[PDB]
Structures are given as C-alpha cells and as structure tokens.
C-alpha cells in the first residue's frame, strides 16, 4: 500500500484538523465520487481496503482513481514504556482528510456499479461519506 | 544579463557614490570625450565640458587634457573645488588619465 518513497523528515508533528478541504473538492477525473463528510487521518490500510473492495465489485472493468495520499507519518511509543525518552516510532502513514474532499472517483462503469462500489468502499472508511456524481459545477472548476 | 562593461562600470561608480562627493564622470567615445560633474543627492549635472562642445582639434590625449582644464575652469567659477573621479568602465590611463590631469592643473581638488 501507499507510502512516500522518500521524505525529508521521518516524523511529523500532529497538527490540526480544522476547516473544510483546501482543495480536492470537485470531481476531476471519473464519473462518480466519494466525498469525506467529516475529518480524519485516513490510514494507508484503510485507503487500500477501500480500493480493493471497489476492484472487487468491478471484478474486471472500470478505473479507480485515488485522490488522497498518506504522506503523514503516524508515530507510536512501544507498548508499556512510560512517557518521555523521545518520540514514538513510525507505525504507518495517514492521509489527512477534511470535509469536502473527493477521496475516490470511479469511471467506465455503470451507475448502479459506481454507486454500490463507492458504498462498500465507504464502509471501509472510518468517516461519514456521500456519493456524488459529476455535475457542471465540477466541469467549471 | 549584464556585460563585463556594464559590471565594471557599476562596480566603480558604486564605490565613488558611497563617499558622497560630486562626481566628475567621463564618457569616452571613439572620437570625443565628455565630462559631467554630477550631484547624485539631487540627480543633477552642475558643470559640463566636451571635446564635442569645444570643437576641439586633433591628438585625442592632448584634447582630453584640454577639456580637462576647460572643466575645472567653469567649475571653480561655480565654487566647486572637491570632486571624485569617475573613471567609468575606463582604466585610469590614456585619454581619461589625461582628462583627469587637466582638471587637476585646472585646480579641481582630487
């Protein structure tokens, strides 16, 4: 699954999750979309689970576009150590996702198929989602 | 993208302005040689002297020296004594050196 091939820095401070998505808010490749309704760090494993379920729905066919990427390293202290003695080790990577972001898009597949795939994919994400389809507003951005 | 000439020129002029004197600037064309004594605080020329304007003669060096003396003369008459020599992109030598020595004889202070 998804992770940076290289980084300038190994650990990142945590930051905040305030606000709507910075960009990434309109459909921009495929036909139907999955937009984040609430903020989260989405884990690489969760992203990959969402993806796999979608290709599984499609069996053969369609294109999946993944529009969020886990470049944030997630740190954790080893079990049972006490506080202090440095920062935890990286245990995974998350992609920060604030409300509005189109996380995934699909194309080349029927409507009932794009609907159901994004629904199932949604169930793998630890946030509330809405499925959108491409409008003129998307096309005008 | 500047040239060795544009650079040379800046580099010497920059040093001269830094000292705050009136600057005796010198232009040297293939044929003639001109001199402004400029006030850079005001962006103004105070006295001129040219081989072009003096309808001066022949040997360029001798000519330079003449504009040199010419400049100093109009200069002292205006109360200007001290001044700084702006050799421009020109080595202090030749016609320029000659111009310089002339404003010197002429009584200009530098």
């Amino acid at each position: 699954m998804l992770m940076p091939r290289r980084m300038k820095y190994r650990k990142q401070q945590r930051g905040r999750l305030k606000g709507a998505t910075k960009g990434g808010d309109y459909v921009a490749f495929g036909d139907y979309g999955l937009v984040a309704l609430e903020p989260a760090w989405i884990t690489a494993q969760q992203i990959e689970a969402a993806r796999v379920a979608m290709v599984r729905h499609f069996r053969r066919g369609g294109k999946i576009f993944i529009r969020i990427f886990p470049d944030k390293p997630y740190t954790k202290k080893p079990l049972e150590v006490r506080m202090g003695k440095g920062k935890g080790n990286v245990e995974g990577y998350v992609a920060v996702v604030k409300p509005g972001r189109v996380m995934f898009e699909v194309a080349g597949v029927t409507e009932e198929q794009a609907m159901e795939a994004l629904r199932i994919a949604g169930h793998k994400l630890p946030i509330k989602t809405k499925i959108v389809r491409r409008d003129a507003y998307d096309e005008a951005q | 993208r500047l040239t060795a000439y544009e650079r040379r020129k800046f580099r010497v002029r920059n040093r001269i302005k830094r000292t705050g004197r009136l600057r005796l600037s010198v232009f040297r064309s293939l044929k003639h040689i001109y001199a402004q004594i400029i006030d850079d605080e005001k962006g103004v020329t105070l006295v001129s002297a040219s081989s072009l304007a003096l309808k001066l003669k022949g040997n360029k060096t001798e000519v330079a020296r003449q504009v040199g003396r010419a400049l100093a003369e109009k200069a002292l008459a205006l109360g200007i004594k001290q001044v700084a020599f702006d050799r421009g992109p020109y080595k202090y030598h030749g016609r320029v050196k000659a111009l310089a020595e002339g404003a010197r004889e002429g009584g200009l202070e530098f």
Binding site: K8, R56, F58, R60, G61, G100, D135, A136, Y137, A140 | -
Partner: protein
C-alpha cells in the same frame, strides 16, 4: 439551446442574507461594465446544469436589458458542495476564449477489449465569435486501443473556431481496466521502507 435567466441588481445587501433567502450572489462584467448582481439559486441551478460554461445565458435584467453572457467562474462552498457565487461574463461582438464540449462519437476498440475510455478533456478551450458558438465538437475515438490517446491536434474544428490550447495537449485515452486477477500480486507485493534524505555531512 440558448438559455435565459432573470437577474437582479444588488448594492449593499449582505451575501449571507441573499443566500439565506435562496438567492445566489454573483457579478457580471466585461471590459466595459462591472455590476453586482444576484440570481435565484434554484432557477440558476436549473439553467446551469444544462448551460454550464458551455452555452450562452441571457440575463433578463430588471432595467429591461437582456445581456448575453457566459458563466465564467462558479464558486463552490467546499464543505457543502453548493455554488456560493457566480461570474457572468458579458459577451460582446469580439471573439471570446471559451470551452466547447467534446463529443466522443464511437466505441473504441480498446473498450471492446475490456478497456476504459478516459475522457481526459470533456471540453476544449477555444477563441471564437459569440455568433459562431458550436453546440459541440465530435471526436472519433473508435480507432483507440488500450493504450492509445488523442490530442487537441487530432481535433477537427468547425469554421471560425481556433484552438486556444497546446496541440500537444492530450484529450482522451484508453487505459486497462481494473482486474481482480491483479489483487493477489498487488496485495503480496513487498514495498520498501521510505528513504530519509540525508542531512549534514551526508548528502
């Protein structure tokens, strides 16, 4: 078609008040005028979904004028996916830069083989007379295998309409489909630990 939309002038009404009342703030302009306007959202939306930035909208002003315009830019509220402001661009007799819809006529060979047409550009940017606005532009994609592609250069244009984007600009492509048979080798595929760019006497 060519679509019509009632428009109205605003002075100091607060954009939030307008929006709270179903009205979408906006502005119309071109080189000659610049006026603060609003439209009814639900009316605008009805038009816009067919119109887009692609077709002419005529603004029925209360002063009695009827100005022909292109929607130039639409601001969406990023959290709610709703329009929050519109730019109406007032067409005049000069030619204008704009977006003209692509039609991809025909079923690509690649798609028969199981592939997927990626309609990379669903429109194309074009300098053109208002009096000359094409409904669309057909593009034959039937010769496309996985993984071939068309560019704007391959676009056969109508009269009086000139390309406004690099001919080298890719506009559609036919790419391999998703395949469950790839999952196992993807799910098993060992990915290396991230390299950390060396700082210091290292580099």
């Amino acid at each position: 078609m060519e679509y019509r939309l009632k428009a109205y002038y605003r002075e100091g009404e607060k954009p939030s008040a307008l929006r709270r009342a179903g009205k979408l703030p906006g502005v119309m302009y071109n080189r000659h005028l610049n006026r603060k306007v609003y439209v009814d959202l639900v009316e605008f939306d009805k038009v816009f979904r067919q119109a887009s930035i692609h077709h002419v909208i005529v603004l029925e002003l209360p002063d009695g004028q009827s100005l022909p315009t292109l929607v130039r830019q639409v601001n969406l509220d990023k959290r709610r996916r709703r329009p929050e402001h519109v730019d109406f661009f007032v067409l005049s007799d000069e030619p204008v830069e704009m977006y003209v819809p692509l039609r991809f006529v025909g079923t690509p060979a690649g798609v028969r083989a199981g592939g997927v047409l990626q309609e990379i550009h669903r429109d194309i940017l074009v300098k053109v007379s208002p009096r000359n606005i094409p409904e669309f532009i057909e593009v034959d994609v039937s010769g496309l295998e996985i993984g071939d592609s068309l560019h704007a250069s391959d676009l056969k244009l109508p009269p009086g309409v000139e390309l406004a984007v690099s001919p080298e600009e890719t506009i559609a492509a036919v790419v391999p489909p998703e395949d469950v048979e790839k999952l196992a080798e993807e799910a098993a595929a060992e990915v290396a630990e991230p390299e950390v760019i060396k700082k210091g006497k290292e580099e």
